[PDB]
Enzyme design. Structure first.
Site, PDB file in Angstrom:
ATOM      1  CE1 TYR A 130      -7.488  -2.058  10.865  1.00 47.11           C
ATOM      2  CE2 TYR A 130      -8.682  -0.035  10.287  1.00 47.11           C
ATOM      3  CZ  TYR A 130      -8.573  -1.202  11.036  1.00 47.11           C
ATOM      4  OH  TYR A 130      -9.563  -1.482  11.922  1.00 47.11           O
ATOM      5  CG  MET A 188      -8.516  -4.424   7.832  1.00 49.73           C
ATOM      6  SD  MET A 188      -9.975  -3.695   7.106  1.00 49.73           S
ATOM      7  CE  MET A 188      -9.811  -1.960   7.506  1.00 49.73           C
ATOM      8  CD  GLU A 227      -8.227 -12.153   8.500  1.00 49.88           C
ATOM      9  OE1 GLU A 227      -8.169 -13.155   7.761  1.00 49.88           O
ATOM     10  OE2 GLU A 227      -9.262 -11.439   8.545  1.00 49.88           O
ATOM     11  N   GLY A 260     -10.166  -8.667   6.327  1.00 48.59           N
ATOM     12  CA  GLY A 260     -11.233  -7.706   6.642  1.00 48.59           C
ATOM     13  C   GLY A 260     -12.278  -7.423   5.560  1.00 48.59           C
ATOM     14  CE1 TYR A 279     -48.271 -12.556  13.131  1.00 48.34           C
ATOM     15  CE2 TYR A 279     -48.646 -11.215  11.145  1.00 48.34           C
ATOM     16  CZ  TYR A 279     -48.811 -12.410  11.857  1.00 48.34           C
ATOM     17  OH  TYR A 279     -49.537 -13.459  11.334  1.00 48.34           O
TER      18      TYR A 279
HETATM   19  C1  LIG Z   1      -7.122  -8.239   8.707  1.00 45.39           C
HETATM   20  C2  LIG Z   1      -6.455  -8.126   7.361  1.00 45.39           C
HETATM   21  O1  LIG Z   1      -7.253  -7.777   6.502  1.00 45.39           O
HETATM   22  S1  LIG Z   1      -4.483  -8.524   7.156  1.00 45.39           S
HETATM   23  C3  LIG Z   1      -4.159  -8.507   5.315  1.00 45.39           C
HETATM   24  C4  LIG Z   1      -5.004  -9.522   4.491  1.00 45.39           C
HETATM   25  N1  LIG Z   1      -4.677  -9.340   3.061  1.00 45.39           N
HETATM   26  C5  LIG Z   1      -3.809 -10.140   2.456  1.00 45.39           C
HETATM   27  O2  LIG Z   1      -3.233 -11.057   3.051  1.00 45.39           O
HETATM   28  C6  LIG Z   1      -3.479  -9.843   0.975  1.00 45.39           C
HETATM   29  C7  LIG Z   1      -1.898  -9.985   0.726  1.00 45.39           C
HETATM   30  N2  LIG Z   1      -1.527 -10.472  -0.662  1.00 45.39           N
HETATM   31  C8  LIG Z   1      -1.594  -9.407  -1.398  1.00 45.39           C
HETATM   32  O3  LIG Z   1      -1.900  -8.372  -0.794  1.00 45.39           O
HETATM   33  C9  LIG Z   1      -1.275  -9.389  -2.909  1.00 45.39           C
HETATM   34  O4  LIG Z   1      -0.929  -8.004  -3.090  1.00 45.39           O
HETATM   35  C10 LIG Z   1      -2.470  -9.785  -3.838  1.00 45.39           C
HETATM   36  C11 LIG Z   1      -2.601 -11.319  -3.831  1.00 45.39           C
HETATM   37  C12 LIG Z   1      -3.770  -9.051  -3.456  1.00 45.39           C
HETATM   38  C13 LIG Z   1      -2.206  -9.426  -5.269  1.00 45.39           C
HETATM   39  O5  LIG Z   1      -0.814  -9.463  -5.505  1.00 45.39           O
HETATM   40  P1  LIG Z   1      -0.153  -8.692  -6.790  1.00 45.39           P
HETATM   41  O6  LIG Z   1      -1.102  -8.310  -7.913  1.00 45.39           O
HETATM   42  O7  LIG Z   1       1.022  -9.629  -7.213  1.00 45.39           O
HETATM   43  O8  LIG Z   1       0.300  -7.289  -6.124  1.00 45.39           O
HETATM   44  P2  LIG Z   1       1.418  -6.858  -4.994  1.00 45.39           P
HETATM   45  O9  LIG Z   1       1.584  -7.753  -3.786  1.00 45.39           O
HETATM   46  O10 LIG Z   1       2.826  -6.753  -5.771  1.00 45.39           O
HETATM   47  O11 LIG Z   1       1.011  -5.417  -4.597  1.00 45.39           O
HETATM   48  C14 LIG Z   1       0.178  -4.497  -5.239  1.00 45.39           C
HETATM   49  C15 LIG Z   1       0.371  -3.163  -4.475  1.00 45.39           C
HETATM   50  O12 LIG Z   1      -0.704  -3.094  -3.475  1.00 45.39           O
HETATM   51  C16 LIG Z   1      -0.109  -3.286  -2.138  1.00 45.39           C
HETATM   52  N3  LIG Z   1      -1.016  -4.147  -1.316  1.00 45.39           N
HETATM   53  C17 LIG Z   1      -1.627  -5.285  -1.673  1.00 45.39           C
HETATM   54  N4  LIG Z   1      -2.366  -5.699  -0.633  1.00 45.39           N
HETATM   55  C18 LIG Z   1      -2.257  -4.838   0.370  1.00 45.39           C
HETATM   56  C19 LIG Z   1      -2.778  -4.711   1.680  1.00 45.39           C
HETATM   57  N5  LIG Z   1      -3.626  -5.572   2.253  1.00 45.39           N
HETATM   58  N6  LIG Z   1      -2.382  -3.636   2.405  1.00 45.39           N
HETATM   59  C20 LIG Z   1      -1.532  -2.701   1.942  1.00 45.39           C
HETATM   60  N7  LIG Z   1      -1.048  -2.795   0.715  1.00 45.39           N
HETATM   61  C21 LIG Z   1      -1.378  -3.839  -0.084  1.00 45.39           C
HETATM   62  C22 LIG Z   1       1.257  -3.824  -2.348  1.00 45.39           C
HETATM   63  O13 LIG Z   1       2.026  -3.519  -1.183  1.00 45.39           O
HETATM   64  C23 LIG Z   1       1.645  -3.052  -3.618  1.00 45.39           C
HETATM   65  O14 LIG Z   1       1.827  -1.677  -3.275  1.00 45.39           O
HETATM   66  P3  LIG Z   1       3.312  -0.984  -3.574  1.00 45.39           P
HETATM   67  O15 LIG Z   1       3.601  -1.149  -5.035  1.00 45.39           O
HETATM   68  O16 LIG Z   1       2.890   0.468  -3.168  1.00 45.39           O
HETATM   69  O17 LIG Z   1       4.193  -1.688  -2.513  1.00 45.39           O
END
Ligand SMILES: CC(=O)SCCNC(=O)CCNC(=O)[C@H](O)C(C)(C)COP(=O)(O)OP(=O)(O)OC[C@H]1O[C@@H](n2cnc3c(N)ncnc32)[C@H](O)[C@@H]1OP(=O)(O)O
Ligand SMILES: CC(=O)SCCNC(=O)CCNC(=O)[C@H](O)C(C)(C)COP(=O)(O)OP(=O)(O)OC[C@H]1O[C@@H](n2cnc3c(N)ncnc32)[C@H](O)[C@@H]1OP(=O)(O)O
Ligand SMILES: CC(=O)SCCNC(=O)CCNC(=O)[C@H](O)C(C)(C)COP(=O)(O)OP(=O)(O)OC[C@H]1O[C@@H](n2cnc3c(N)ncnc32)[C@H](O)[C@@H]1OP(=O)(O)O
Ligand SMILES: CC(=O)SCCNC(=O)CCNC(=O)[C@H](O)C(C)(C)COP(=O)(O)OP(=O)(O)OC[C@H]1O[C@@H](n2cnc3c(N)ncnc32)[C@H](O)[C@@H]1OP(=O)(O)O
Ligand SMILES: COc1cc(C=O)ccc1O
Lengths: 240, 246, 246, 235, 247, 238
Positions: free
Chosen positions: B73, B68, B141, B118, B237
């Site tokens: 979100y 998410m 989470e 998510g 069935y």
């Molecule tokens: C219920 C739920 O789903 S809560 C969230 C669960 N998701 C997570 O924990 C993932 C968090 N870790 C990350 O998000 C990392 O970005 C990774 C591991 C996916 C990859 O990291 P990297 O390639 O080093 O990328 P990085 O963290 O620098 O960010 C990439 C871009 O996408 C964004 N981004 C990455 N994940 C998310 C996310 N879940 N939501 C919003 N933005 C995100 C970053 O903020 C950044 O955007 P910006 O340049 O506009 O600030």
């Protein structure tokens, strides 16, 4: 039991009822006639104190090639026939009074999956081949085939095999959890017998209580099973 | 062509195979309200489009989906009107699993990279799943200060053992694709170089079946897990006879 | 100081980790009505102790637990009034799973050795489990002339595949720790020599989480197994929003 | 004139949703389905709308279902469900079927999706499905299951025989049957009473009840305390 | 038993244990104290052979006027979050965990007011007789919370769908005749004949083999949760269990 | 069916097959012999074009006075199985519609086939009771579930726990049966309902009544899937 059923043989050796599907020329395809005789076989063996454990196997190369296409084809008659398939495949068999083992010697397809999983335990040959080939014949799996998969095989693997209709061998059946164990064909019989002998040695009433209780408790919450599982323990003590 | 049609999602159909590509790669395919509403639109459109026989769900860039969208979100939404929060939650469900889990057509998650939080709902909602060895998974989470939200825990319950599901939910440790396959979360993990072609071969197998029959078979299996054997005799069935009609 | 508090059990706290030690090693930690009652008191007590954030349930000496006490819990209860049998069973359930399965705080079974029969209920009630490779397991009930009593069969159903569960329940065969991890009964089997270290490592990861959020996560997972996807949409968001309040 | 097939009116917080295909005895077409989804979704975000009263225009409440490749059917079935019970059963806001007349067939599902129901004594209900050669479709049979006892449900399903507003109140199908000259006034007193409640709390309460019927006591201890805690948060 | 609980009185009368909610100054409102004492009372009575049937009633004009709003919060805020887990559990423990599948048959004798949290133990009791003069209401909503604990489930088990939703949603009050007509209670009778009618019932229950009665009433409550096929297995297991234990 | 069954009788008249429990000398008590024959009866009537609706009734004063009050332990499994086989396993979801016509005494194990029958009419003069408790058994087979399905919670528990009898009018007000009529008018009232049902397409009637009993077990979401499947199965079998 010599010569008593057209499509099935029963041979009892030291407490072990080998129940042999016997339409080898049709690869033990399950016809309405085999269904009605299998009902008779199960009810008969239930009341026979000579049979302490049932081993369900196939004559020749098949365990079973599934339901009989030709022999299956008044609206209401399909009611009776589908009931008769269910009656031995799992309504009698899933919660049978005596312990049961599928001994899968070869081909196992489609509707074969229902008695396969209704039998408590299962051993196969490495050489046995399985598949849910219904999708390739243009029907979803019929009867309890899909529940038999759901009970024994993980969600993604069930779906893969149901949706694609691909075949898999004995080792793979065991890896997946569809059977207890897969062994070379030449060891099939002795491995099965060794297991049946272990079961023969338990109190039959106790064993029934344990095996039925497990199957049932998958359906029930912990609080329901507190009541249910003690009711079985206590029922076992009355009857044992 | 669906060229230029959506802001956050691309659809590219080849030979019966509709590749649905989450398309916010600069945000690692984070699932925002815009993406969630467009994905609803996407699934409804593709449903009625005979050129799409199998849906493959995948992500642009490095991510499959990073979860998410933490900004759009969660954070932007959580302090606004409660009734909009409830609508937003519902729209996430609508496509992640309400339309998708019992989708009319066969579905494959093709997990190219990151898969967090998510993202597990649509992952498991898709019938089948291939990931890349190089894909990283996580239920983060817990470390962000919330239990898994939406259907994430049930997605785990459906596909992964009890011990393993509780371990990952409780610790929030990440695992790679060979681990995802071993645990049952996906069907198969293959090196990224071999991902699309492995996915394409499964999709062509699926496109060979009668769609209506394939729908009865996949839907019937998912539902029979919920029913007793006696209930299933009736129900299964009914699905075979319903299938015969259609 | 929990020292000298209970006859058949010990509690040792240690930087947030409360080691709850079944302590009748002369009787291989067989579960007598006295142990059952004292364990109820243990669990209620530690629930309200802030010094304890994770419980580790283990055994003194060579056994984790050899099961229900054949003498104190079976033979002596059969000779008492019927109505007392009732109280006795309830007290066993009370600590083994009624308080313990949904316990407020994270729980780990640290299975150092023998685990038989009735031992399987608190085993699977505990959220996580690590055993010793050297630990031996057994559902010996069948061989004593009873089906598994209390929640033992459910314990297996939750963690171990169908065929494997019936095999062990039907034959009463024992198995070792590595095979327990393989079956999904525990999380992990390690040598005894490493068992405590590995467990503390896990417990410390758990102590990092927000306790209320962690509760919500591990409770919602166990309950979601029980509910359809539509019921869980409601249930799991209520868990999430209850977690935000608390 | 926002919708073709449905009128809406908001007075003192009460949103009367009026099925408006009078010429057709408010029979439910695909168009109405689609619009009803729009209505429910629109009214949900309306800060002025506190309670929803679902009625028909002229004499029918609704006569039921109004009677493209195979797969289009999937879509038409889904849209029906989507307004009749998927959105409506667990609606954010309290809901009252004000059943002014004819209520047959598929109209049973939104009937029972609505929290409460007041009908006019002069209203006729029927599960005519049988007589036309189909078993009840959509969620008709579950709606009866939820509200009307086993024997009576089977009776009216199997025979297709019809029944009045008095016999509907008596069977548990609706809350009250009153004279059509009082229907509106009775309905509005109820609605006003519901409007004085904290809307988030009312939502926790009504949803809680509907779910708790599917759950065991132990399951509900977890669940109903979660709805309560949820309520303390969202309110 | 005499003067043993601060908030409950127990009067055993030739096999019939009258259990009396005893805070009439506070309308038998269920405080955490009372919850804890009622658990002790239920456990104590289970193992006392002088109690063959339990009748649950209230001192004063009330049966019980619900959860004690003052001392729930008084106790809960003097402590941390985890204290509410303990308090909620103790309420559930006597209201229904022990009470709903109790070893001994139970009857609610509802002599007056019965509000909110009162519905759980009322329905956990196997059978119930009330006074026509008794007033029932689910006032949680007017107090701005949904029914908590098992109240809504108590309603779902005994009262039809429309009627439960109506009373939960409005918080409107209802009387004894209405309560019996809704299926909430077995019977409603003038307060003057309440004790008479209850005691006739309790004594009927006394005629039966306790273990057999327990099997029947527990098996009926469980069976509502199970399919016919499941019940075939479950209900014969209870029958056979009864034959083993009936002595 | 002249003299085919020892303990049961069959009489079809213009679509209605009256199935008559036939041990009036034992108040139609259900022996193992009766259980086996009833299986055979219900199977035979299922395949007979002549029977369109079955009406389950008792010879003499009783509908049934319940089970008729061994060898190796295993024999019980069989006897318990054959009791359930006709009482509800075949009967509850039977292909053809079924009505219980409860002419008199209905006790104990008789509530299982009573509730399995789709509809029921009893005589005002009929007496019911769950006498088990009085003989020192809790109710056996599907008796308590038969109550759970038709009769409210407080009332079910009352009659089960007390073992008290109730007449035909109280049976109808509880929900145990559809209607209570005088005895003099039982056969008529029943035949008229039987005839309304015979006017329905059988396959369509089966879909509707099986779907209703099953939907009680399923959530709304499960039912969207399950009821639309039943409807589509109907449209095929036609
Ligand atoms: C219920 C739920 O789903 S809560 C969230 C669960 N998701 C997570 O924990 C993932 C968090 N870790 C990350 O998000 C990392 O970005 C990774 C591991 C996916 C990859 O990291 P990297 O390639 O080093 O990328 P990085 O963290 O620098 O960010 C990439 C871009 O996408 C964004 N981004 C990455 N994940 C998310 C996310 N879940 N939501 C919003 N933005 C995100 C970053 O903020 C950044 O955007 P910006 O340049 O506009 O600030
Ligand atoms: C719900 C359901 O059961 S649907 C599932 C049934 N699906 C199937 O895919 C089984 C189809 N059969 C097969 O794949 C093959 O017969 C195999 C692989 C089992 C064995 O193949 P072979 O060793 O080459 O044997 P072959 O194909 O010659 O079959 C031998 C005989 O068995 C008959 N037979 C095999 N399976 C079936 C069957 N399911 N039903 C009826 N007859 C069958 C064949 O028609 C053939 O008959 P014939 O020689 O009298 O003409
Ligand atoms: C429903 C149930 O839970 S049925 C019972 C299930 N439990 C079992 O089957 C395990 C029974 N126990 C055993 O087999 C063994 O005691 C083992 C394998 C655990 C350990 O083996 P050993 O090291 O050889 O120890 P040993 O058998 O000598 O036991 C030492 C003492 O522990 C006691 N003990 C061990 N298990 C139990 C038990 N479950 N209940 C009561 N006492 C026990 C022994 O009786 C013995 O007592 P004693 O010295 O007062 O005579
Ligand atoms: C979660 C739940 O259970 S929601 C709460 C459900 N309960 C209620 O709404 C009951 C509220 N109380 C009432 O409606 C009234 O007290 C009635 C109808 C029970 C009785 O009315 P009356 O005869 O007028 O007595 P009255 O209202 O004067 O109260 C008598 C005393 O009992 C106390 N009392 C009554 N009910 C409660 C209660 N639920 N909690 C705490 N105290 C209560 C009153 O506060 C009053 O205290 P005080 O006189 O020491 O200051
Ligand atoms: C925890 O209580 C029990 C456990 C067992 C395990 O077989 C059997 C009977 C019991 O009462």
């Amino acid at each position: 039991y010599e010569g008593r059923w057209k499509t099935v043989k029963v041979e009892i050796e030291d407490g072990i009822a080998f129940v042999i599907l016997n339409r080898p020329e049709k690869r033990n395809a399950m016809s309405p006639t085999l269904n009605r005789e299998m009902i008779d076989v199960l009810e008969t063996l239930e009341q026979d104190p000579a049979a302490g454990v049932l081993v369900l196997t196939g004559a020749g190369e098949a365990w079973t090639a599934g339901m009989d296409l030709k022999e299956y084809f008044p609206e209401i008659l399909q009611e009776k026939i589908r009931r008769e398939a269910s009656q031995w495949q799992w309504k009698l068999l899933r919660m049978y009074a005596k312990p049961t083992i599928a001994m899968v010697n070869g081909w196992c397809f489609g509707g074969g999956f229902s008695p396969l999983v209704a039998c408590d335990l299962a051993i196969c040959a490495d050489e046995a081949t399985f598949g849910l080939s219904e999708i390739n014949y243009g029907i979803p799996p019929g009867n309890l085939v899909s529940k038999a998969m759901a009970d024994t095989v993980g969600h993604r693997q069930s779906l893969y095999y149901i949706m694609t209709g691909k075949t898999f061998g004995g080792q793979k059946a065991a890896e997946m959890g569809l059977v207890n164990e897969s062994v070379p064909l030449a060891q099939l019989r002795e491995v099965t017998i060794e297991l049946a002998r272990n079961l023969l040695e338990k109190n039959p009433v106790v064993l029934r209580a344990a095996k039925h209780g497990f199957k049932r408790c998958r359906e029930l919450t912990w609080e329901q099973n507190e009541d249910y599982l003690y009711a079985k323990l206590d029922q076992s003590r009355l009857l044992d």
